[PDB]
Subunit: 337 residues, 2 copies
Amino acid sequence: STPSYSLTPAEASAVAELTLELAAAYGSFGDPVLLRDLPRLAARLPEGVQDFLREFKLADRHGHTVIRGHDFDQRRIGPTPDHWRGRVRPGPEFPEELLLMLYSALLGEPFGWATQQDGHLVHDIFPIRSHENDQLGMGSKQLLTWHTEAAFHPYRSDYLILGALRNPDHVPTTVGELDLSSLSAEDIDVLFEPRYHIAPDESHLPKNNTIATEEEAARFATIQRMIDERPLGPLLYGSRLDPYMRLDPYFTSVPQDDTDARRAYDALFKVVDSGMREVVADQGDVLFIDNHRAVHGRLPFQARYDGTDRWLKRVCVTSDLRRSREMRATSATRLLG
Amino acid sequence: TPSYSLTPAEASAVAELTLELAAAYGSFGDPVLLRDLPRLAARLPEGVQDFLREFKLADRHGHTVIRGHDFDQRRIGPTPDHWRGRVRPGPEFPEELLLMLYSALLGEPFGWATQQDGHLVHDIFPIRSHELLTWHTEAAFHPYRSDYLILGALRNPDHVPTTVGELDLSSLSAEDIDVLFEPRYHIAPDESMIDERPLGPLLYGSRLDPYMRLDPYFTSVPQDDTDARRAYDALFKVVDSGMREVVADQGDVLFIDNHRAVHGRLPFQARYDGTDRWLKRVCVTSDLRRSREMRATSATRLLG
Ligand SMILES: [Fe+3]
Ligand SMILES: [Fe+3]
């Protein structure tokens, strides 16, 4: 099936030790020196773990992989919080967040969305009672149906890194890839063509934010133009033999009169749906998603709200930070918005 | 403009590393070397990694230089007559490896399948057979052009310059810039499947501090677009008049940001006796996957 790496207890221990040393040496993520040193620091990780991610990145074949067996010290980490707002930064789980930042530097550059949890590079995935009814990360009861992250956005993540601090009930993440053998050459061709409209989530709508001041007008200008012009785009791209995809069923409009587009899209939708895997990121697992080769989602679960709930950390990764310069306030900031 | 001058200790640490690596891997066709490159770059002196990383993340300067490497002139040998025919890797392999390590610090080495048999490390030396004063963005037309160029000067006995120039913005007005940000210019290919099409901009990214792709010789503006030709003229004047002479001396490695700086070379009398100027050159991509459609396999780093 899809490769994973299981850490020996020695490797788990060397990672944990690195991670505590760095938490203590660096103050927060607000320290620009940390961001600068990341790739050099990620080269102190066990070499087998660095070779493995590098092969995964370079092979550009599997849509996800997992590194299992980290030691995430429960007593040190503490209770799953009630909310992301108002916590002291960094929390006692700072070593785990640093972990994920080191991994993100092996794969490219960590970045974040200005609208998402105040733009924390490593963000939180846990149940907030007040968000109980919503379809998202901090949700619970609602099925989070599968999708490419920010499918419509030309600067969407290349990879996503999910780190499970706890998952007492073993609640799986859904991830699914494209079995191309299942699609007709006719359907593929159609899917490669600019025929499909992919709509922004509300979170990316520009009229969300500060209407005036030239800066912020120029910065949303590309997304505005996209809303105003509704250009059609492909669902499949890269190589015909092994294509990338971006599929967000909920926000995709197949134009009514394009009979060929509809036929191929249903083909594509059905293949990806029936290929969907449940992947359990247990405590001490880190899940890597290739945003160009897999969709992901999450199953509903009952939350307790007592500090014992599932708690994942998440980092968005770009292979090319400069590409998005137009959507960033400064050269230095890693936040779009 | 920021540069880093190696101590002799640093210089020796680098030479030693590149010699150890050269004995350890056969050639660049070794997929394991290619895999290992970021991890191996992390064995270079720390101050050098931090310096390069500050340059990449600052995204402020058009070029930078790391000075005072120890390029062993006896080992490296005389400057050859041609690249073609020549066996690879040669005795200058240590220095090519260095450039590959630098390139892994900035992104990923790639090349073009139709330049020099698609050797990831290109040669720059006088050839009799193929025997300027222009400046350009590398592959300005191409959407998968280099993000950075790395130029290592194995030797440059007559101190012949490279030309590099950036955009001084304050000499352009906000009308001209706004025009240049729009998709109203054609940029032609070269002797270099997915093909010719739309009209691109010249300036992009932030409007307060723009990137550029600017190849004067192969740029055209539709006659009818007179706002465009006016603000084009005003961009060229700014750029051409800002050009600097940068000498990549023996032991210098020049890093050019392909989005913030154009470069060219200056004509020079060659002598063809094995003692001429020899640079090496590696093209760097921030996002190798972005070019997948023009590469024959997942694994190859050659475009086309
Ligand atoms: Fe998601
Ligand atoms: Fe050139």
